[PDB]
Amino acid sequence: GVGISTGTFNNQTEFKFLENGWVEITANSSRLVHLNMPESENYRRVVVNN
Amino acid sequence: GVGISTGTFNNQTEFKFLENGWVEITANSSRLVHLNMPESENYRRVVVNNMDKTAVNGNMALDDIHAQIVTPWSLVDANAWGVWFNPGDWQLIVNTMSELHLVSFEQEIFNVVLKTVSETKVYNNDLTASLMVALDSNNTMPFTPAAMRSETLGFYPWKPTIPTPWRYYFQWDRTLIPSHTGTSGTPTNIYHGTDPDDVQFYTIENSVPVHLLRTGDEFATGTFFFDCKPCRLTHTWQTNRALGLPPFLNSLPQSEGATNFGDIGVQQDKRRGVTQMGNTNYITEATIMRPAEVGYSAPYYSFEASTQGPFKTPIAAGRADGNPRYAFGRQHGQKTTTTGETPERFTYIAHQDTGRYPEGDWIQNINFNLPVTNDNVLLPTDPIGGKTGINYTNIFNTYGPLTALNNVPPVYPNGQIWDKEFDTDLKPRLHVNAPFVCQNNCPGQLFVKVAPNLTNNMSRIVTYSDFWWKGKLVFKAKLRASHTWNPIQQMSINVDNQFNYVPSNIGGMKIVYEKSQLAPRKLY
Amino acid sequence: GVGISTGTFNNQTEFKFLENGWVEITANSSRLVHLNMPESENYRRVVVNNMDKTAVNGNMALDDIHAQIVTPWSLVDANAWGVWFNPGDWQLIVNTMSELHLVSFEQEIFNVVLKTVSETKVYNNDLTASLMVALDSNNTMPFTPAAMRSETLGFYPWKPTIPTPWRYYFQWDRTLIPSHTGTSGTPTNIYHGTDPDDVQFYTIENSVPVHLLRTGDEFATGTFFFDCKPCRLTHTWQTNRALGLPPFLNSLPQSEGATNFGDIGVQQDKRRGVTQMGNTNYITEATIMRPAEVGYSAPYYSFEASTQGPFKTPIAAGRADGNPRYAFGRQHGQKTTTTTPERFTYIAHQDTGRYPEGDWIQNINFNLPVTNDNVLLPTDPIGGKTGINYTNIFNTYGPLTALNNVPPVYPNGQIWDKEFDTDLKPRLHVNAPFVCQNNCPGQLFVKVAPNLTNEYDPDASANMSRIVTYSDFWWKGKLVFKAKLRASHTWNPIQQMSINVDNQFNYVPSNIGGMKIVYEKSQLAPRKLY
């Protein structure tokens, strides 16, 4: 619903050590992404000519 | 069979990884050991004396009187870091691992060679005579770690080495009434002989096992297992000033720069918090209570006559004083092609902040007026006992129930690895000699001597022996995890120290010293 | 029995026939090896700098400036063709086999004996001290093939041999700005030093386990198993001109004779075919499309510089440039009873070469009797320098190039080589017919142990006092090949290698016991490209 959160922020890096000298690097990353509405809703075809 | 060989020359540190991020480090090390026959085949109690040197009033510290029993046996001692690890291997331990354990240890001797000299000079083998070897398995003999005298086994695999001729202490008593230079009279500085109640001597024949090796035999020690607690390869920076919650800053800086400091808004006498200062309302970061104490002050460099004899008081941590002051020779890291006889020296200035800075300490009286007047405060500038050169920090001691100390850091390549706990009832909290200390027991020394080569001191054929030593010291260590945003300090080759880790054009080599506890640790 | 051999000497070549024309060739080989104790017991970081010879203007190519770690160890390297085959078996192989697989390989050491000298010189045995032997099974150590320097084991089975004193390069940095004789001043020519990031000092003791052999015991290797692609003992002759269907002749010759050439009937602009030239109507053998390109032009005698100084660009093929020149000694095929190296240059049948004096480029317009301004010939000075034409700076390597792997060279040619541990790997190596796909066999390192005197102490700055000592041991190896027998598809005979009147005296020994092994071609028979 509106008031129930739907995930967990996480940015840990976890180093799990396996046998025979291998390391599984679990790189997590999380960002708050801000997004404005588009400038114009139409697909445009624009030529740059300097 | 005499001809067939008896072992394999190995020197590989081998890394085997395990579950949960542990690494089993198997340090194989092995050398050629050379040994000439003893000067005489009998023990000899000896008393050494430098009465002429310490006779001059002022030379307290040069007192070198002692008594020892020169012994035909020679000591093979591998208890030093440089014996087992090369510099790159040491980098791979210190940079990557976080804590270290001792696991197991064995020694074998193999490919025994015995040689005889005849007058030019001619060298001939001798299969009739034999090499004598004895392992104190039960820790009967006194423990004599050769690292403290820089006489352990050679650190370079490709150079042969010799064992130290064994010696151990004989009971002695003496006294000095120390006095400064220019004292009006000679001090009482007389030797007192020996107390017969505490004399000991260690015979071998029917009491201790001994083995005889001809060319073809192999002496193999069993696999000892240690019981030591982990040595930690990280250092703590947090002094008592850097514990607990800092104050909340009401006036934070703006516009950047070095001079734009922060400010605590609330005045000093209006502060909130807790202080162990019953009659003072000022809660400052000096006066604010902390959970405990780290490190401790202790005296240094002054003595007075009493019953205990001469001694050199050890201190657990340092800011020079407290830091160790290693000196050592060509076999143990000095440039092998150097001439002369001066040893190379360094001072291990450890990364720990648990030391003390005496120049900043002070005492002030109980009433605590803030702009303290001269009579009400004791400084290091004050003479104590009238002598200008001594101040109140020289005699001070803040050891109490609240102190917290780290163990001694490991020192590569000259540092001792393990040592034995004392037999007393109240054991010492830590040892300055080595990082690991054996609780119950850890192996007595392996002794070696050449048998008498008599006519088929007592007459003997000029005889000397060479033999390949091998050992395997197993460690268990935990790989580190990155907790901070920022990187840590790591050992690295650079342009300044490039040539320290590579042979010269005429074959010279050296092993410079490297810090052990590089990474920081969260204390509290 | 200590005095009775721990193993048997062998050099006999065993041929065994499998189904479908396969054959297994076991080249058994054994050599007596003489080994003197090292001049020094320590590793030495030696730097060579022939500034005296290089500093003169125009001697840029004579740059020997380098650094290397001189070790107290020595290397037993059997990686050369002459070590394993005599001229008879190589002759039979190259005359009867079409393909050659490198299959397996093993070594062992046997009949080790260790001697010492006393003082006239009196030689004594010492059964108590040890020879030091190590095999780098994991290929930890740098791969240093001795065939390049001609320091492999001797090819003659009956003479003694010595192993090469082993060394490896150590990183240096150097600049040498080129100059010509008559340059206005001294160019920049200095030795920078070494960089800290690239320092690598290996040691045998720390890397590989060292076996301490004595008389009455042995070291033997588990047999290595190769997986290399087959070398081919047949050359391909067809350049691009001889690829595809020829044109049809409307006028076949009416009578036999050298001067009675045939003639194409159709005018060159009116023929039929496919040409890769959009604006040209002439269909000619030079202009007609072919499936791909055979061989490639590359800049010849071009020297390129990097951190470690200038070096020559290798070329995969040749026509005098490109073809390899060897210089070898008495152990490796020089006439033994002679008292400079002996030399040859392998003018192989592989073809895929180029003839630089025949190349040209002309303008895209293709005015057919091409004027001077519209063609650049090999006679034109590039950069005003009359000796350097365009082919010196010309590269035609492209997606359409097709090349053949290098020939084997008997007796001095290397057999195998180590694949580079770079991400992108070369298509071929120009110094071995086989390249190990993941690992080569380990290098066998040998050393006489320190035979000390009673005077030794470590604190002395002087070198340790050692008794004069050497050792003598016999090496053995067993190399297994696999090969395909050829077939007579072609009517006419092929150029088989055989003894003739001129070359007959090279095989037999001289009256004073001297011998030689002459160089022998490998890819004799021809082969289709298409």
UniProtKB/TrEMBL annotation, chain B:
<dbReference type="GO" id="GO:0140267">
    <property type="term" value="P:symbiont entry into host cell via permeabilization of host membrane"/>
</dbReference>
<dbReference type="InterPro" id="IPR016184">
    <property type="entry name" value="Capsid/spike_ssDNA_virus"/>
</dbReference>
<comment type="similarity">
    <text>Belongs to the parvoviridae capsid protein family.</text>
</comment>
<dbReference type="Pfam" id="PF00740">
    <property type="entry name" value="VP1_2"/>
</dbReference>
<dbReference type="InterPro" id="IPR001403">
    <property type="entry name" value="Parvovirus_coat"/>
</dbReference>
<keyword id="KW-0945">Host-virus interaction</keyword>
<keyword id="KW-1162">Viral penetration into host cytoplasm</keyword>
<protein>
    <submittedName>
        <fullName>Capsid protein 2</fullName>
    </submittedName>
</protein>
<feature type="disulfide bond">
    <location>
        <begin position="438"/>
        <end position="442"/>
    </location>
</feature>
<dbReference type="InterPro" id="IPR036952">
    <property type="entry name" value="VP1/VP2"/>
</dbReference>
<keyword id="KW-1164">Virus endocytosis by host</keyword>
<keyword id="KW-1165">Clathrin-mediated endocytosis of virus by host</keyword>
<dbReference type="GO" id="GO:0039615">
    <property type="term" value="C:T=1 icosahedral viral capsid"/>
</dbReference>
<keyword id="KW-1160">Virus entry into host cell</keyword>
<keyword id="KW-1173">Viral penetration via permeabilization of host membrane</keyword>
<keyword id="KW-0167">Capsid protein</keyword>
<dbReference type="GO" id="GO:0005198">
    <property type="term" value="F:structural molecule activity"/>
</dbReference>
<dbReference type="GO" id="GO:0019062">
    <property type="term" value="P:virion attachment to host cell"/>
</dbReference>
<keyword id="KW-0946">Virion</keyword>
<keyword id="KW-1140">T=1 icosahedral capsid protein</keyword>
<feature type="domain" description="Coat protein VP1/VP2 Parvovirus">
    <location>
        <begin position="1"/>
        <end position="493"/>
    </location>
</feature>
<feature type="region of interest" description="Disordered">
    <location>
        <begin position="318"/>
        <end position="340"/>
    </location>
</feature>
<keyword id="KW-1161">Viral attachment to host cell</keyword>
<dbReference type="GO" id="GO:0075512">
    <property type="term" value="P:clathrin-dependent endocytosis of virus by host cell"/>
</dbReference>
